[PDB]
Amino acid sequence: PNRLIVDEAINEDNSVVSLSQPKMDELQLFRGDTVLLKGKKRREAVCIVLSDDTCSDEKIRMNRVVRNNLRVRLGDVISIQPCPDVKYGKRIHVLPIDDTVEGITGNLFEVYLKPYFLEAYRPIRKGDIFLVHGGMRAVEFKVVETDPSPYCIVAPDTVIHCEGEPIKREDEEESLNEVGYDDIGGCRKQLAQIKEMVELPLRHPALFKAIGVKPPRGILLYG
Amino acid sequence: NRPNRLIVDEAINEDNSVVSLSQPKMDELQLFRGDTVLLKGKKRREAVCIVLSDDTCSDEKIRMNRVVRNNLRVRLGDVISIQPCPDVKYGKRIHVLPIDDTVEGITGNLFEVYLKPYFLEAYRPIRKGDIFLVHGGMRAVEFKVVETDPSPYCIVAPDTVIHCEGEPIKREDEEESLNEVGYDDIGGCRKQLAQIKEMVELPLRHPALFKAIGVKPPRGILLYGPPGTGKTLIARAVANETGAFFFLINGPEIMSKLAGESESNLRKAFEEAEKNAPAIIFIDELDAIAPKREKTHGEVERRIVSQLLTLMDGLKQRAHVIVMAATNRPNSIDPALRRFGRFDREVDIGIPDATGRLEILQIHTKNMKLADDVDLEQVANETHGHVGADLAALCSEAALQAIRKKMDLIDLEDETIDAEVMNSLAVTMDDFRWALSQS
Amino acid sequence: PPGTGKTLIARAVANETGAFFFLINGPEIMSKLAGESESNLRKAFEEAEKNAPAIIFIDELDAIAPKREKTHGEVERRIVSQLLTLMDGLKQRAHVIVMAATNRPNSIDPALRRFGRFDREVDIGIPDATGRLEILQIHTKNMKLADDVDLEQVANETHGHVGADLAALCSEAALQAIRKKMDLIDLEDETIDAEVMNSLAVTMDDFRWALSQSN
Numbered sequence: 001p002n003r004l005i006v007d008e009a010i011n012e013d014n015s016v017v018s019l020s021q022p023k024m025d026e027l028q029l030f031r032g033d034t035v036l037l038k039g040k041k042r043r044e045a046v047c048i049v050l051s052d053d054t055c056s057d058e059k060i061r062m063n064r065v066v067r068n069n070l071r072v073r074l075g076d077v078i079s080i081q082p083c084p085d086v087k088y089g090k091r092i093h094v095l096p097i098d099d100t101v102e103g104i105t106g107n108l109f110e111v112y113l114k115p116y117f118l119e120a121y122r123p124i125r126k127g128d129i130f131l132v133h134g135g136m137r138a139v140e141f142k143v144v145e146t147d148p149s150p151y152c153i154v155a156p157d158t159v160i161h162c163e164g165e166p167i168k169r170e171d172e173e174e175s176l177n178e179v180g181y182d183d184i185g186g187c188r189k190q191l192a193q194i195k196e197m198v199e200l201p202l203r204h205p206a207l208f209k210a211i212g213v214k215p216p217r218g219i220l221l222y223g
Numbered sequence: 224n225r226p227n228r229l230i231v232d233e234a235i236n237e238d239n240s241v242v243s244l245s246q247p248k249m250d251e252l253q254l255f256r257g258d259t260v261l262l263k264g265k266k267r268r269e270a271v272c273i274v275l276s277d278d279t280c281s282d283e284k285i286r287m288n289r290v291v292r293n294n295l296r297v298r299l300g301d302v303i304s305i306q307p308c309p310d311v312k313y314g315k316r317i318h319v320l321p322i323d324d325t326v327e328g329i330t331g332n333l334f335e336v337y338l339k340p341y342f343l344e345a346y347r348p349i350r351k352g353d354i355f356l357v358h359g360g361m362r363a364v365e366f367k368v369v370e371t372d373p374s375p376y377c378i379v380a381p382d383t384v385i386h387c388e389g390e391p392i393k394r395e396d397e398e399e400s401l402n403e404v405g406y407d408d409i410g411g412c413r414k415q416l417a418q419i420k421e422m423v424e425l426p427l428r429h430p431a432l433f434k435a436i437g438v439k440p441p442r443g444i445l446l447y448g449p450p451g452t453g454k455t456l457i458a459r460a461v462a463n464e465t466g467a468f469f470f471l472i473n474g475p476e477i478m479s480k481l482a483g484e485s486e487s488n489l490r491k492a493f494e495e496a497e498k499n500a501p502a503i504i505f506i507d508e509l510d511a512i513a514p515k516r517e518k519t520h521g522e523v524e525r526r527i528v529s530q531l532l533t534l535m536d537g538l539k540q541r542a543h544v545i546v547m548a549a550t551n552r553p554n555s556i557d558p559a560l561r562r563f564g565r566f567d568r569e570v571d572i573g574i575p576d577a578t579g580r581l582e583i584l585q586i587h588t589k590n591m592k593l594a595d596d597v598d599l600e601q602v603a604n605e606t607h608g609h610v611g612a613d614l615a616a617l618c619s620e621a622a623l624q625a626i627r628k629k630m631d632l633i634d635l636e637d638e639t640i641d642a643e644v645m646n647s648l649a650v651t652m653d654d655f656r657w658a659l660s661q662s
Numbered sequence: 663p664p665g666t667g668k669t670l671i672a673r674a675v676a677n678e679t680g681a682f683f684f685l686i687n688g689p690e691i692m693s694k695l696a697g698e699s700e701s702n703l704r705k706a707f708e709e710a711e712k713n714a715p716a717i718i719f720i721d722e723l724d725a726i727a728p729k730r731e732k733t734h735g736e737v738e739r740r741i742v743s744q745l746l747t748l749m750d751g752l753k754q755r756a757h758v759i760v761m762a763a764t765n766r767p768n769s770i771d772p773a774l775r776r777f778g779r780f781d782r783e784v785d786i787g788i789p790d791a792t793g794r795l796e797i798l799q800i801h802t803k804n805m806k807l808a809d810d811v812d813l814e815q816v817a818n819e820t821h822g823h824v825g826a827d828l829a830a831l832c833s834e835a836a837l838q839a840i841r842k843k844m845d846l847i848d849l850e851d852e853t854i855d856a857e858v859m860n861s862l863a864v865t866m867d868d869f870r871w872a873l874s875q876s877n
């Protein structure tokens with residue numbers, strides 16, 4: 001009813017998720033409304049929602065950044081619900097993750113945080129991990145706490161502390177500047193084919209006990 | 224011996240409960256179209272069937288399904304006695320149970336999925352101890368008839384109560400699985416199949432005969448054709464279909480072994496088929512082992528070719544072993560193999576034509592629920608240059624497409640795909656027309 | 663060409679002239695490992711020397727002694743030589759004739775055609791119509807043929823056939839006629855008396871069928 005299949009993002013923004021127009025009408029959501037998304041393993045994340053008229057009705061486009069905080073891969077299921085109850089924060093606390101900051105010195109507020117948030121009005125959740133590009137390297141930041149806990153918006157008013165020591169990566173947490181379909185271009189057509197070939201046997205593998213059909217076993221790549 | 228015994232032939236009417244007969248032989252036996260008959264075969268076994276007039280059937284032969292053949296414990300070309308059975312009245316109780324090794328993976332109600340549609344307006348004769356086969360939900364399921372109320376045999380009318388009570392049953396030694404490959408599992412090449420069958424007929428079915436006569440049976444059979452044409456398939460089938468033992472020699476797998484242990488294997492293959500006679504040894508991708516004597520660079524590759532040729536000669540005609548082998552062309556092979564006494568028999572398993580392709584398609588869509596708009600005839604016409612395995616994968620893809628479409632809608636739980644949910648899953652002509660853009 | 667009775671002739675001549683017959687099969691010799699391959703080849707000549715007079719028959723010669731460049735690697739050449747030595751080492755007083763067969767001259771190492779070795783070449787060609795008839799007769803001499811069987815006709819139809827083609831043709835035509843009767847012999851088995859056997863005629867139809875099979 002309100003549950004959706006998680007698809008690839010076309011709007012490469014961390015805080016936004018797209019949805020088909022009629023599915024927004026169905027769920028009674030307005031363009032720019034903020035939504036709470038729940039995924040696997042007790043996890044949720046907060047996002048802005050926009051109408052994408054190329055999106056499938058029962059699917060929801062979202063960034064890898066988001067997917068991660070939800071602990072879901074592409075083609076999974078997530079519940080979406082409205083969240084207009086969300087308010088500007090006083091006091092966000094972010095820390096960089098040590099393995100994305102070896103080599104860079106000093107003030108990383110001015111370089112990443114600041115331009116990532118100028119007129120941001122970004123929804124965020126405690127325990128969120130987001131990614132900022134710049135200075136020829138991408139940096140991951142975890143939100144260690146927020147003043148309206150558990151989730152707040154970040155307005156010009158909101159004070160933002162990145163207090164010294166970078167934090168260790170959790171086992172659960174996956175490097176975001178690891179390798180994804182968003183790291184490869186010029187070959188959507190070919191990529192699509194690979195994805196569907198591998199979709200079921202890798203994502204829904206228990207299925208092949210239930211049916212006598214044969215999944216492709218070997219895939220050859222020309223070029 | 225008598226005017227009622229017959230030779231068991233291949234079924235053209237692919238229905239479990241019917242057997243066909245030549246019109247004059249029905250007149251001779253005074254049987255009527257639709258009359259139900261009792262068939263007695265080997266090892267104390269009998270089965271009950273409807274009978275229909277087939278005007279392409281031989282007068283002294285009787286067409287029947289593999290399903291039936293099994294319950295009669297007979298292979299093709301054997302003898303069975305047929306007699307009228309108008310005494311069979313409808314049943315009340317029937318107890319069927321699925322055989323464990325055809326139901327691993329499927330859940331819950333298998334009545335609604337298989338039994339029910341198999342019996343809707345069936346009026347099917349059946350016997351206690353019969354094992355029949357139902358197609359659906361992308362897997363075939365074998366069910367044994369554990370008892371009937373009019374014992375030993377009854378007909379199953381709408382009135383008849385049908386019970387499949389829980390626990391699936393173990394398979395007996397005598398009972399042979401039906402997924403096992405048969406000639407009904409291969410299409411588009413009757414002509415070539417016929418030849419194979421008669422070549423192998425006597426030496427595998429009546430092997431003691433060759434002590435009595437000084438005639439030489441073919442020892443080696445070579446299978447020409449592009450790859451994926453069912454060359455392997457045919458050999459697998461013929462072995463099962465004629466109750467012969469089947470030893471596979473895979474060309475590349477033999478070259479994978481180090482020098483000398485490569486031959487020690489090859490030799491051990493012939494020693495295994497000798498041991499379990501009669502047998503078909505099937506050498507797949509022959510040219511991997513025995514290519515033209517100049518195409519073999521280095522000694523050990525030639526030492527192998529020879530080692531084979533020695534085993535082929537060393538093959539006594541009294542061994543009762545037929546060696547079948549397959550390759551993509553004649554010219555690939557060392558012409559030494561085509562000598563009298565070795566691979567003296569060459570069969571050309573070609574490229575299925577339109578009509579053949581249709582069959583192939585039908586053989587691979589026999590377990591899946593197809594939509595009304597599915598036009599397999601159309602598909603056949605579109606797939607102009609396709610070999611059998613092309614089409615088998617086409618059906619595999621079209622189905623996996625239809626599963627992906629539903630796999631989104633089955634978000635609600637997993638791994639929750641019941642056998643019932645499975646049969647809910649139809650495959651649209653669209654899913655085929657899509658799968659065509661791939662192959 | 664192969665199947666022309668090259669082996670057959672050698673077998674015959676040995677028996678027909680009371681000579682001992684040792685068969686050397688080309689491929690079978692290459693099947694053996696290195697050095698034990700020669701130890702066999704040498705032991706063949708030692709066996710024919712021992713039982714004189716004899717014909718040693720080397721079948722599929724080219725399997726052993728192909729053109730000196732067609733032999734890749736040493737042990738294949740070491741074999742060719744080992745033969746040539748035995749061919750020379752063959753005393754004329756030994757009373758042993760070595761016969762050998764192959765599909766063509768060019769396949770063979772021309773070293774073998776030297777004076778004192780394979781100095782004599784005979785060309786067992788392809789049977790012509792009249793020949794094919796004989797072959798057919800030779801392989802139908804134990805089977806009961808039907809009146810309508812016209813082996814002359816068969817010969818004419820089988821234009822490009824070698825002897826072994828025709829020997830198998832007869833074998834098939836007979837196995838066809840057996841299959842036809844094998845249905846009617848349902849009554850018992852293995853009950854095929856020698857008498858039931860002679861009841862079994864082979865119709866011209868069984869031949870015309872067997873023609874649709876062969877090469």
Ligand SMILES: Nc1ncnc2c1ncn2[C@@H]1O[C@H](COP(=O)(O)OP(=O)(O)O)[C@@H](O)[C@H]1O
Nearest residue numbers: 408409410450451452453454455456611612615
């Ligand atoms: N004529 C045919 N009829 C039915 N199935 C076929 C046919 N040809 C190929 N197939 C299917 O495609 C595959 C062919 O594999 P294989 O038997 O190895 O063919 P080949 O030996 O010609 O390569 C088999 O899995 C079989 O199910």
Ligand SMILES: Nc1ncnc2c1ncn2[C@@H]1O[C@H](COP(=O)(O)OP(=O)(O)O)[C@@H](O)[C@H]1O
Nearest residue numbers: 563664665666667668669670797800825826829
């Ligand atoms: N000219 C012939 N006359 C009679 N039989 C023949 C003739 N040619 C071939 N055959 C038969 O066919 C087979 C030929 O085998 P083989 O003697 O090895 O011929 P080759 O050595 O020419 O290959 C034999 O079994 C023989 O019975």
